[PDB]
């Protein structure tokens with residue numbers, strides 16, 4: 001009855017193809033598997049462990065709140081939720097927040113809100129949502145239909161309608177499809193899944209202008225790119241384009257299942273009692289942990305450190321390219337890094353990831369052509385050098401015949 | 403200072419929370435900011451199935467919390483596989499998927515039923531049959547499968563091919579089902595819908611019709627699962643085995659966690675990348691749910707749920723004898739609904755508020771029904787104390803006459 005990679009196939013729905021090793025312990029930006037093999041973690045569980053594994057402050061918040069109160073339901077409010085809400089409100093454009101459990105749920109709330117606001121303020125026919133090719137917004141039927149990857153939205157029966165997709169960064173295309181029957185434009189300021197592509201300033205400002213013109217709400221999905229990832233608290237702050245609604249998850253709780261939807265009072269008022277809800281959403285345990293996380297991430301020193309560390313990674317990636325000639329582009333913001341493979345290595349991202357893991361380093365992909373890095377925002381310089389040397393080793397092994 | 407007014411300044415106006423704010427819980431007692439003590443018969447809507455800060459759950463939280471919280475589903479993890487094995491061993495399930503809420507578990511179940519039909523039968527086999535008054539969550543898809551139009555209206559185009567008929571109306575289901583039907587989705591006991599239990603004939607009938615039409619029978623046990631009814635799952639009480647089952651709430655005793663349970667044959671319809679989750683199935687949630695499962699799935703705890711139900715029922719009967727307020731006491735195990743007599747129709751919220759004033763937390767199940775969903779291990783002493791408080795509350799409401 002030992003637990004092995006084979007056990008996965010016997011137990012879990014076949015929706016994942018997990019690695020051949022099972023991480024069992026983590027500390028900072030290091031992880032150990034069952035055999036005690038050590039890995040440097042540049043993946044962050046896909047940009048989630050923004051303060052690494054078992055950060056003492058987050059462990060302390062978890063344990064202390066864990067002794068006090070976990071859950072009371074939204075029949076009630078609670079102190080950690082209200083404290084966290086205040087912090088988000090003070091630090092951002094938001095005037096009101098709703099807490100949920102996952103990015104998908106935050107997006108569901110955001111999209112329902114944009115829909116309902118249009119229904120109540122303007123017209124029940126103002127239903128069109130504009131989104132972008134390659135977008136990822138979650139796995140619910142509604143959110144995956146707003147997502148821009150048909151491979152993930154096909155095959156589940158009738159999709160919720162009135163969603164139009166155009167290319168990311170194509171402002172003309174957005175102008176062309178938008179009208180007085182449009183309720184929302186939904187965009188990731190950096191498409192994390194779709195090759196780590198950042199919105200251009202003209203594009204993002206243009207979305208703000210078009211939403212103003214058409215009385216549509218601009219929704220920023222900052223599930224991946226928010227909570228310090230870009231080296232600003234939220235990516236919108238880098239761009240200086242303020243959305244109507246913003247969603248946050250992943251880094252928000254440093255690994256704890258939590259998410260948030262942020263908006264203004266005027267927009268929040270379109271919801272009435274019972275318009276939306278959640279059993280677990282905004283429970284005091286999640287909110288205590290996310291509070292601790294927020295308090296660390298939202299400091300000048302940590303935010304500056306994110307840029308320092310980005311350049312430490314970028315310098316290694318450039319050195320790897322000088323030696324092995326494998327990258328055409330190194331992009332992203334802060335500690336969301338994408339490195340696009342040259343045409344010679346098109347479709348090989350998964351192979352470099354696999355070789356990385358063999359070499360003791362966890363990395364990501366962003367589609368089949370792009371390597372992705374989303375380490376802890378406080379990853380130690382020593383871990384960056386050690387892990388990037390392991391990665392350079394993996395690259396060397398892969399390109400040996402080429 | 404954090405007050406009730408603070409909520410109005412901070413959270414979307416989707417809730418109208420009580421004027422008091424719980425800050426601490428231990429077992430089935432809760433304290434607010436003023437230090438007022440409450441007996442908890444609400445369980446945060448049937449979630450804290452082992453009460454607040456149960457030592458075993460706190461232990462599991464702390465132990466895993468100092469080890470590993472999250473690695474993403476790029477990897478599996480020991481707690482997820484341990485918990486999966488436990489659920490598989492104890493139920494009809496052969497495979498599971500962990501998610502973060504009941505809504506998410508239902509999303510997974512409904513997408514799976516749809517996808518299984520598409521790949522195993524026909525892309526046109528899309529009809530989902532569900533029931534009036536059903537509650538399945540708040541996502542656009544799940545609220546559309548839910549049977550309360552008030553909650554699904556007003557969000558733009560709903561996902562199509564969902565048909566609603568009355569709960570417990572087997573004839574109506576037979577009438578709407580055909581070869582183009584992919585699923586029948588049902589709560590074995592409708593919790594939010596007045597605490598209405600399925601009849602044996604209705605549930606066994608759904609199984610037969612699903613077999614006839616090659617549709618999947620999906621039990622939403624988010625509320626009635628994980629010991630709530632005095633069996634591990636309500637389907638076990640009924641002896642009707644569904645094709646897919648969803649679980650949340652009690653599963654994590656307060657921790658955000660949920661599960662979708664099915665057979666290998668059905669699970670195999672999904673391919674890699676068909677569904678997924680960032681947080682779903684993380685080792686922390688699974689460690690806590692594992693500890694919860696290990697406690698709830700014992701003969702003693704499950705026997706106790708029935709002893710305790712009768713303790714509640716007897717008090718509710720004593721209250722009706724004194725005050726003439728209840729027409730029916732129903733539900734299963736420690737999901738209890740007490741329907742109000744005609745004279746008190748629509749006033750369940752009045753009794754809930756009087757309850758809170760009197761130091762006892764209770765629920766409603768629509769405007770005509772009082773609902774109780776305490777910890778499955780609630781102490782006899784707390785049942786008596788909370789029920790005497792509730793009796794004082796009823797006395798106060800009746801006295802205004």
Ligand SMILES: Cc1ncc(COP(=O)(O)O)c(CNc2cccc(C(=O)O)c2)c1O
Nearest residue numbers: 102103104136137138193223224679680681
């Ligand atoms: C931009 C974005 N939006 C929404 C979600 C949905 O969040 P939840 O999973 O918590 O429901 C996500 C994250 N969802 C997700 C899941 C698996 C992989 C990846 C990846 O970026 O490779 C992303 C995301 O990255």
Ligand SMILES: Cc1ncc(COP(=O)(O)O)c(CNc2cccc(C(=O)O)c2)c1O
Nearest residue numbers: 278279503504505537538539594622624625
């Ligand atoms: C049968 C059922 N199905 C799905 C859900 C959705 O679960 P989540 O909330 O974890 O996403 C629920 C519970 N959802 C829920 C929320 C608020 C109130 C009530 C109530 O029964 O009064 C129920 C439920 O009771």
Ligand code: NA
Nearest residue numbers: 089092093094
């Ligand atoms: Na603000």
Ligand code: NA
Nearest residue numbers: 490493494495
């Ligand atoms: Na089994």
